[PDB]
RNA sequence: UGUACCAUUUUGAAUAAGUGACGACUAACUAUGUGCCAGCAGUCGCGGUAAUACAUAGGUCGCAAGCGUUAUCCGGAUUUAUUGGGCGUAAAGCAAGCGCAGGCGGAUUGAAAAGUCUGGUGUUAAAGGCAGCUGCUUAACAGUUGUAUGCAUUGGAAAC
RNA sequence: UCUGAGAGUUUGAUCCUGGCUCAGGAUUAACGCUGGCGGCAUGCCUAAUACAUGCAAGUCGAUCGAAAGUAGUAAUACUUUAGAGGCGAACGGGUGAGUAACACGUAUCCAAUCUACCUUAUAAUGGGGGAUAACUAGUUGAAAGACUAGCUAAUACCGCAUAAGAACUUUGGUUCGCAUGAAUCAAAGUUGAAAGGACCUGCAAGGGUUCGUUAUUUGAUGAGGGUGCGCCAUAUCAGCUAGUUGGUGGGGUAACGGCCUACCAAGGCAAUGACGUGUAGCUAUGCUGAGAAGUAGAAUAGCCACAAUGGGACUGAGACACGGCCCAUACUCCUACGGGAGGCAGCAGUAGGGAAUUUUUCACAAUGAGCGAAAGCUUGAUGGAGCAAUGCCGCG
């Protein structure tokens, strides 16, 4: 029941996430298990720095992505690729 | 000071301990048979009871699995 | 087959005065946190003479850990080299 | 924030702002350490920590520089890579309102410093508010439009006399800066670099 | 949250400076009053009727939206000295001997490889430290990349 | 490629040993004087003292009966939930009392283990029964409630038919291991399951998607145990230990185990520091130092322990459960005197202690969590806004 999901290590006024390979029950800004990749909201282009093969290899394993983790996945197209190996 | 779900959660284990003690009571009473009159038909009840138990997470399935190879070993024994 | 290995401890019996069991003694030379110099320490372990290994007293024994058989029994004893005493 | 008696602590140092605009005055041409006690004996023979803090506090009074911006600025600038006896006085004297000044549309450094703080200059690509901003050679400082008509404007666009070190293209006052103020440049007022030795004892 | 921020928007220097010190360590001195009294003090020490050390004023010096005093911790302290001290006269050789355990120990050969050196692998969570860069008007700060130490296993070295 | 400053002070004067003091940083800081603003960060170190008050874990009608309301001549349509049921309440949040030991860090062995939801793959989801919540009526009361007799429903519960594969054994083979001992068969015996919902099509019959259920398979995460090493002061604490050490049979535990039991023995640790006393959450790290290292374990993050004190247990994959249950102790409160209610070391806040440390606030808008198909709902976690020169940085 691992959760690929964000995580904050911003300031007050700015955020800043990181997709990261965590379990469902551990606290936000706690311990993981593997880094997916940062994130800025106000990045203007390339918001998400995904990794691509760690993910990939966590998703094979079973994680249950969230929403915005899922639409970060879309934008780049690492959604195609999970389904069409899935196929 | 006290929640709803607390108060549900304890009247329903109220009737599900019931139900299961009935149910363990039964299985001592079957194994205590077995052994008071040791036969080779009463370890299949033992059986029986033992699995429906370890299914149903009334008993622990490994307890269930250990008492089933004692009983087992008993009769190969006295057989 | 890969099966992961145990490990290892050589020492020299003290005693054995109980049912199947021989106290032996490792020795180390762990340097000091502060002068850096070795300290020869002592432990005593325990065992159990099952069978077939007898080892009896002053003898060279190798040990090899083992899932706890009895509280303060963690250790088996194997080849015996050196045998005397 | 700054003392209101610059001609008290340039009689004090004894070296004013390289024109002895505050020296020559129009009274009395005094060049003796304030107060009554200043006409005495026992002039020579100042401590070590003596010289070093009256070279620092000149140092630190040439450009209204508080001491603990000092220190952040020498923390800055120690860690590099060796000797920078050729980068900390870049570091020392890339100070926004100082190249205003050097640029040469103020009459003088805290003046330049208000107007900076006011508002009337610009930067590269941006605005500027703040008087602290370092600077590296290159940036196209562009003064403002607004403040070209100002009833103070005349002395500011009389930049004709401007360091070398700072090229306005004049007429146009873009007021760039390349090639870096040399120790000619940055004249005996303080050439000293045991100062430095001073900060690397009290700061770590 | 009508918030950050912006504009030729009216008015206008208008709405804004304290604290410690001045005999030496430690940058910075004169007068008035008191007269071993009143008081100061981190240390040496000032005050007995000419006080740059007390109280006031003036002047000057160190910092500054902070400045002093207090408490605790580290350094300076080689002042528990592995790095890095000593025991004749300054603190310190037991009154002397026989001495188990421990520490140290002559020369040469062989083996193994427990110490020692070195290669591969796994790990030492993230944050923190150091180096580089980006973004906040620059900074503080935030983010990003690199960056060790130890343990275990396996493969070699054989001088001690 | 690291990398270190000193001075004053014993004497009439000098050299040395030697102690004291100062020049530098830093804090969860407090006090005096004074005081304009902004960007970040911190803010009961003492009484794990006692708490007024208001909020801090619910959700699903697409599981189920009933009831209510709005429409409708009716048949019926829509909305809402007291109750049964499922899942979640063991996460998340706080505090550091206790604990000097496998508590923690590191490295490992689990041939001595568990793991709900999740991932891959594989067989089924057929047919019956008896009840009880809600409701009705009576007794007892101001009410909380409680007791008694009838009425119902299911994905609640209990049988039965059936095992692709499962579990426990028998027969001999395989490959063996590290001593117990594991791994794989071919045949056989015994034992063993459940539940439907939503929607579409189809005259119907039937068919279909999806959620969910039973039995398995693969991983992954999480939990538990054992061991080597590291980890305070004190000898003005020298003996400690009788389930303590070991062996046999049985029981119990997810598992090995004196974990427990009956029998037989006398052993086990200890001057290389047991045991006793005192103190303390441990660590990554903070501050300092040229370095070796000294010191505190702010904030935050990993692990442990606790929930007024002390015990026990149900449900459950997981608790011996902060805002679940039972009992005792202490305290406070309510009463119509029979009986009851309570646990802020959750968010604010009050009293008290102290030199001293803040709103009795707004929003789920983002991130995360739980339920749900969604509508959404809940979220004092979280994000903001107040207060405070508390610290760094910046401007007047
Ligand atoms: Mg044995
Ligand atoms: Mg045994
Ligand atoms: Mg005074
Ligand atoms: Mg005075
Ligand atoms: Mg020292
Ligand atoms: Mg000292
Ligand atoms: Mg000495
Ligand atoms: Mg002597
Ligand atoms: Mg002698
Ligand atoms: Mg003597
Ligand atoms: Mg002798
Ligand atoms: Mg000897
Ligand atoms: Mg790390
Ligand atoms: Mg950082
Ligand atoms: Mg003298
Ligand atoms: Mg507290
Ligand atoms: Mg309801
Ligand atoms: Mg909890
Ligand atoms: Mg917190
Ligand atoms: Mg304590
Ligand atoms: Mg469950
Ligand atoms: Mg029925
Ligand atoms: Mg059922
Ligand atoms: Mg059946
Ligand atoms: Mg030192
Ligand atoms: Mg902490
Ligand atoms: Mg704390
Ligand atoms: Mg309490
Ligand atoms: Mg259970
Ligand atoms: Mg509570
Ligand atoms: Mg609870
Ligand atoms: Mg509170
Ligand atoms: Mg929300
Ligand atoms: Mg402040
Ligand atoms: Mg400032």
Same mark, same amino acid.
């Given at each position: 029941?691992?959760?690929?999901?964000?995580?904050?290590?911003?300031?007050?006024?700015?955020?800043?996430?990181?997709?990261?390979?965590?379990?469902?029950?551990?606290?936000?800004?706690?311990?993981?298990?593997?880094?997916?990749?940062?994130?800025?909201?106000?990045?203007?282009?390339?918001?998400?720095?995904?990794?691509?093969?760690?993910?990939?290899?966590?998703?094979?394993?079973?994680?249950?992505?969230?929403?915005?983790?899922?639409?970060?996945?879309?934008?780049?197209?690492?959604?195609?690729?999970?389904?069409?190996?899935?196929? | 000071?006290?929640?709803?779900?607390?108060?549900?959660?304890?009247?329903?284990?109220?009737?599900?301990?019931?139900? =299961?003690?009935?149910?363990?009571?039964?299985?001592?009473?079957?194994?205590?048979?077995?052994?008071?009159?040791?036969?080779?038909?009463?370890?299949? =009840?033992?059986?029986?009871?033992?699995?429906?138990?370890?299914?149903?997470?009334?008993?622990?399935?490994?307890?269930?699995?250990?008492?089933?190879?004692? =009983?087992?070993?008993?009769? =190969?024994?006295?057989? | 087959?890969?099966?992961?290995?145990?490990?290892?401890?050589?020492?020299?019996?003290?005693?054995?005065?109980?049912?199947?069991?021989?106290?032996?003694?490792?020795?180390?030379?762990?340097?000091?946190?502060?002068?850096?110099?070795?300290?020869?320490?002592?432990?005593?372990?325990?065992?159990?003479?099952?069978?077939?290994?007898?080892?009896?007293?002053?003898?060279?024994?190798?040990?090899?850990?083992?899932?706890?058989?009895?509280?303060?029994?963690?250790?088996?004893?194997?080849?015996?080299?050196?045998?005397?005493? | 924030?700054?003392?209101?008696?610059?001609?008290?602590?340039?009689?004090?140092?004894?070296?004013?702002?390289?024109?002895?605009?505050?020296?020559?005055?129009?009274?009395?041409?005094?060049?003796?350490?304030?107060?009554?006690?200043?006409?005495?004996?026992?002039?020579?023979?100042?401590?070590?920590?003596?010289?070093?803090?009256?070279?620092?506090?000149?140092?630190?009074?040439?450009?209204?520089?508080?001491?603990?911006?000092?220190?952040?600025?020498?923390?800055?600038?120690?860690?590099?890579?060796?000797?920078?006896?050729?980068?900390?006085?870049?570091?020392?004297?890339?100070?926004?309102?100082?190249?205003?000044?050097?640029?040469?549309?103020?009459?003088?450094?805290?003046?330049?410093?208000?107007?900076?703080?006011?508002?009337?200059?610009?930067?590269?690509?941006?605005?500027?508010?703040?008087?602290?901003?370092?600077?590296?050679?290159?940036?196209?400082?562009?003064?403002?439009?607004?403040?070209?008509?100002?009833?103070?404007?005349?002395?500011?666009?009389?930049?004709?006399?401007?360091?070398?070190?700072?090229?306005?293209?004049?007429?146009?006052?873009?007021?760039?800066?390349?090639?870096?103020?040399?120790?000619?440049?940055?004249?005996?007022?303080?050439?000293?670099?045991?100062?430095?030795?001073?900060?690397?004892?009290?700061?770590?």
């Amino acid at each position: 029941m691992v959760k690929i999901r964000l995580m904050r290590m911003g300031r007050v006024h700015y955020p800043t996430y990181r997709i990261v390979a965590v379990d469902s029950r551990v606290k936000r800004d706690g311990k993981y298990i593997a880094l997916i990749g940062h994130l800025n909201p106000a990045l203007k282009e390339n918001k998400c720095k995904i990794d691509e093969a760690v993910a990939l290899e966590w998703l094979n394993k079973g994680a249950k992505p969230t929403d915005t983790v899922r639409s970060l996945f879309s934008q780049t197209g690492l959604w195609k690729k999970f389904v069409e190996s899935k196929k | 000071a006290n929640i709803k779900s607390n108060e549900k959660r304890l009247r329903q284990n109220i009737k599900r301990n019931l139900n =299961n003690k009935g149910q363990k009571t039964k299985l001592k009473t079957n194994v205590k048979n077995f052994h008071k009159e040791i036969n080779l038909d009463n370890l299949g =009840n033992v059986y029986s009871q033992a699995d429906r138990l370890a299914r149903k997470g009334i008993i622990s399935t490994n307890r269930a699995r250990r008492l089933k190879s004692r =009983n087992v070993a008993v009769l =190969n024994k006295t057989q | 087959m890969k099966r992961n290995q145990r490990k290892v401890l050589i020492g020299i019996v003290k005693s054995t005065k109980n049912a199947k069991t021989a106290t032996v003694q490792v020795e180390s030379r762990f340097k000091h946190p502060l002068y850096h110099k070795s300290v020869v320490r002592h432990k005593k372990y325990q065992a159990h003479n099952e069978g077939e290994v007898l080892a009896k007293d002053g003898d060279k024994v190798q040990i090899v850990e083992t899932r706890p058989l009895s509280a303060t029994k963690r250790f088996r004893i194997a080849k015996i080299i050196e045998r005397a005493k | 924030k700054y003392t209101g008696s610059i001609f008290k602590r340039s009689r004090r140092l004894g070296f004013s702002l390289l024109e002895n605009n505050k020296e020559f005055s129009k009274g009395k041409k005094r060049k003796t350490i304030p107060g009554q006690h200043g006409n005495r004996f026992r002039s020579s023979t100042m401590s070590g920590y003596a010289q070093q803090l009256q070279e620092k506090q000149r140092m630190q009074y040439m450009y209204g520089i508080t001491d603990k911006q000092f220190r952040r600025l020498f923390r800055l600038v120690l860690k590099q890579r060796g000797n920078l006896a050729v980068n900390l006085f870049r570091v020392l004297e890339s100070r926004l309102d100082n190249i205003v000044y050097r640029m040469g549309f103020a009459p003088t450094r805290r003046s330049a410093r208000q107007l900076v703080n006011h508002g009337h200059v610009l930067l590269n690509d941006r605005t500027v508010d703040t008087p602290s901003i370092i600077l590296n050679p290159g940036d196209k400082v562009r003064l403002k439009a607004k403040t070209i008509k100002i009833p103070i404007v005349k002395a500011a666009s009389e930049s004709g006399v401007v360091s070398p070190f700072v090229e306005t293209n004049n007429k146009t006052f873009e007021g760039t800066y390349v090639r870096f103020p040399e120790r000619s440049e940055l004249p005996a007022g303080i050439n000293e670099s045991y100062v430095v030795e001073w900060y690397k004892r009290l700061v770590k």
